[PDB]
Amino acid sequence: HSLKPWNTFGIDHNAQHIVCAEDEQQLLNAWQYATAEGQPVLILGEGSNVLFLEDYRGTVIINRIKGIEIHDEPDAWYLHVGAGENWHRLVKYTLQEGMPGLENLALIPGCVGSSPIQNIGAYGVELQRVCAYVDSVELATGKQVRLTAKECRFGYRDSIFKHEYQDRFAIVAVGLRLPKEWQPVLTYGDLTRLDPTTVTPQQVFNAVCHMRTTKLPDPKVNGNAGSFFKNPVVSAETAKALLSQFPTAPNYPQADGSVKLAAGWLIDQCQLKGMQIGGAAVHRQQALVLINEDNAKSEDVVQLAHHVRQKVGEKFNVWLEPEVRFIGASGEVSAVETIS
Ligand SMILES: Cc1cc2nc3c(=O)[nH]c(=O)nc-3n(C[C@H](O)[C@H](O)[C@H](O)COP(=O)(O)OP(=O)(O)OC[C@H]3O[C@@H](n4cnc5c(N)ncnc54)[C@H](O)[C@@H]3O)c2cc1C
Ligand SMILES: C=C(O[C@H]1[C@H](O)[C@@H](CO)O[C@H](OP(=O)(O)OP(=O)(O)OC[C@H]2O[C@@H](n3ccc(=O)[nH]c3=O)[C@H](O)[C@@H]2O)[C@@H]1NC(C)=O)C(=O)O
Numbered sequence: 001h002s003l004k005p006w007n008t009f010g011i012d013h014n015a016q017h018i019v020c021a022e023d024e025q026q027l028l029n030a031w032q033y034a035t036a037e038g039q040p041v042l043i044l045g046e047g048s049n050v051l052f053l054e055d056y057r058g059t060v061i062i063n064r065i066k067g068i069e070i071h072d073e074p075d076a077w078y079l080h081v082g083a084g085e086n087w088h089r090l091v092k093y094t095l096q097e098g099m100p101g102l103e104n105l106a107l108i109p110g111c112v113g114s115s116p117i118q119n120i121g122a123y124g125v126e127l128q129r130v131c132a133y134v135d136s137v138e139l140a141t142g143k144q145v146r147l148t149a150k151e152c153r154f155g156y157r158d159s160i161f162k163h164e165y166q167d168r169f170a171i172v173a174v175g176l177r178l179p180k181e182w183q184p185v186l187t188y189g190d191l192t193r194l195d196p197t198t199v200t201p202q203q204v205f206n207a208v209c210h211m212r213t214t215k216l217p218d219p220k221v222n223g224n225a226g227s228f229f230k231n232p233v234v235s236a237e238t239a240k241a242l243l244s245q246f247p248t249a250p251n252y253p254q255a256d257g258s259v260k261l262a263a264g265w266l267i268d269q270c271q272l273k274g275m276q277i278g279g280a281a282v283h284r285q286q287a288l289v290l291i292n293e294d295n296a297k298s299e300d301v302v303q304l305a306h307h308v309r310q311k312v313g314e315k316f317n318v319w320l321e322p323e324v325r326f327i328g329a330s331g332e333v334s335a336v337e338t339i340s
Contacts, residue, residue, distance in 0.1 A: 007047030010223030045111025083113025100201030223292030264288030
C-alpha cells in the first residue's frame with residue numbers, strides 16, 4: 001500500500017495496488033486488470049518527478065522493463081533501451097563501452113522510459129538531441145507504437161507524452177542515437193573551462209557530476225524531485241522591465257525574442273533559501289529545489305511551493321510553474337492550480 005519507496009520525494013501516501021512490470025505483457029495485464037476494476041493507473045519509472053498529493057485510488061505500475069540492444073550504423077550507435085533501465089547507469093554504461101554522447105545528462109535520476117516525457121536536459125543537452133524514437137504500447141488497445149523524435153514534439157521540459165499521448169500510452173523502450181564522431185557540448189557553466197580537443201567524455205562526465213553533486217540533493221539523504229519549478233520564459237518586454245531594476249538576473253534570451261529567467265535565482269533573491277514549511281524546505285545549495293527535510297507531508301510541499309511561487313510573483317511579477325507532476329487521488333492534477 002505505501003508509495004513512499006516509489007517516489008524520491010519520500011512522500012508517504014498509499015495506493016490501492018503497486019505492481020512492478022518486468023515486461024510489457026505484465027504492464028499491459030496490470031493496466032487491463034486495474035481499469036477493468038474501474039481503477040485509475042499510474043506508470044512510474046523512479047517516481048523522481050512526481051508529488052503524490054494524497055492516497056491514490058488506483059494501481060501504480062512500476063516500469064521495470066529492462067534490456068539494452070546496440071545496433072551499429074556506419075555513422076552512429078543506435079541503442080534500444082528498455083523503459084525500466086536506470087538512466088544514470090545507462091550513461092555510465094554507454095561511456096564505459098566507448099559510446100559517448102550522454103555525458104551531459106549524467107546523474108539525472110529516473111528511468112530511461114521517463115526521459116522523453118519531460119525531455120530531460122542539463123548542461124547544454126536535452127534528450128531531443130540524442131533521441132531517435134520512443135516505443136510505447138497503447139494501453140487500451142495493446143498496439144505497440146513508435147514515435148520518431150520529431151513526432152515526440154520535444155520542448156523545454158515538454159513532449160507529446162505530457163499531452164496527447166498521456167495515459168493512452170506506456171513508454172516501453174527508448175531509442176537513442178549516439179554519433180560515432182563524438183563532439184563535446186561545453187557551453188554550460190564550468191564546462192566552458194574545458195578544451196574541446198583535449199577533453200574526454202569522462203572528463204565532461206566528472207565536470208557535470210561535480211556541479212550536480214555540489215548543488216543538488218541526493219534523494220537518499222533528503223527526498224526531492226529536483227527543480228521544483230521550470231525556469232520561466234517572459235516576454236522580451238517583461239525581461240526589459242525586470243533586468244533594468246535587477247541587472248544581474250541570469251537570463252537566457254530565446255529564439256522568438258522572449259527570455260528565460262533562472263527560477264532558482266528569483267527564489268534565492270527572495271531570501272527563500274532554507275525556508276521551511278512543515279517537513280519541507282527550500283534547498284540551500286539550489287533554491288529551485290524543494291526537499292523533504294524532515295518527514296514532509298505532501299501538504300507541506302504544496303504550501304511551500306505556494307509560498308515560493310507567491311513571493312517570487314510579488315517581487316518580480318514572474319509566476320513560477322511547477323515542473324513536478326502532482327498526482328491527485330484519481331490521477332495527475334494541475335500543479336499551478338494546486339499551488340495557487
Ligand atoms: C535530484 C534530482 C535531479 C534531477 N535533475 C534533472 C535534470 O538535470 N534534468 C531534467 O530534465 N530532470 C531532472 N530531474 C527530474 C527527473 O529526473 C525527470 O523528470 C525524470 O525523467 C523522471 O524519471 P522517472 O523515471 O523518475 O519518472 P517518474 O517520476 O516515475 O514519472 C514521471 C512522469 O512520467 C510518467 N511515466 C513515468 N514512466 C512512464 C512510462 N514508461 N510510460 C508512461 N508514462 C511514464 C509518470 O506517470 C509521471 O507522470 C531531477 C530529479 C531529481 C530528484
Ligand atoms: C535539476 C534539474 O534540472 C536542472 C539542470 O540540471 C540545470 C543545469 O543544466 O539547469 C536547471 O536548473 P537551473 O536553471 O537552476 O540551473 P543552474 O545552473 O543551477 O542555475 C541557473 C542560474 O540560477 C542561479 N541560481 C540557482 C539557484 C539559486 O539558489 N541561486 C541562484 O542564483 C545560478 O547561479 C545560475 O546562474 C535545471 N532545471 C530546469 C527547471 O530547467 C531538474 O529539472 O530537476
